[PDB]
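User:
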Amino acid sequence: STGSATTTPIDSLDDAYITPVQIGTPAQTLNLDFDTGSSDLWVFSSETTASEVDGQTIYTPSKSTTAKLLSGATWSISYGDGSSSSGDVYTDTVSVGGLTVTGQAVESAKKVSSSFTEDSTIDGLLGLAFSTLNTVSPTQQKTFFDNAKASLDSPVFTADLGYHAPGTYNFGFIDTTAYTGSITYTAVSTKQGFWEWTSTGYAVGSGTFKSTSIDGIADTGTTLLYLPATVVSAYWAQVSGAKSSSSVGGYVFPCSATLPSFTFGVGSARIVIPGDYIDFGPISTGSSSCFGGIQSSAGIGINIFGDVALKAAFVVFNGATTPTLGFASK
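Assistant: Predicted structure:
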């Protein structure tokens, strides 16, 4: 089997992407944030504290003839950005782009933190990291991909995120029309539960490539590119007036600037992030100070190849017995 679904930016900045997901019988379609950096599929629901729901579409398990309470199971998750959610668990039928999993754990939120409430466009998350990170207790549950894998034509999914435009998540096949040149594959460590890999270096603008190993995670659920302070300083030094602002929480730059590109290495191959992808707009409405899309990972404890990086590539998440990651230009 295969599946193919369009993923759409939630706003004009590509702060996140939402993908429609069918849950239950009859189908209830919710728009979920597909997150290769976590492993829980959780939704706003009829059980979510009412004051914490503001515009989201909810899953109502009592209206699904295939929903079953997973007795005794609870979940609770906290994300890198400080947000969180928790609740109980149902199993139900879940379909993405024509690909159906029966008995998928659907984690129903009883509580969500303010940032989730405040974002009316995201109805929940669909985790695509390794199932070892799933938070369900006392019986850990499998991700949608893990459940689907054996049925797929090939044990892979691909992320093709758009810049200020829709893109695609495919399951079970590689669309050879969706990228240019060849796909370069690189080793993955699953030891921390992430799609963790090692970039071979970087360049800033038209500058020379610096060969240096940068360990990090391919994370579709993180907006920005978080790299070591040395790398980030070298990037922003090429932008007149750019500075790190403790009050804002990262590098800012004059909105009048033209940003240089940023290149990262995948083996001997190179992925170029155009400068415009690195502009996250005014820090506050009407400001001429703009927020940068490349930020320091210092104090996160890990480097993160988030959407800023991934959207410059066609990315293969290869879930074969030994997982690997592939990157192509597009």
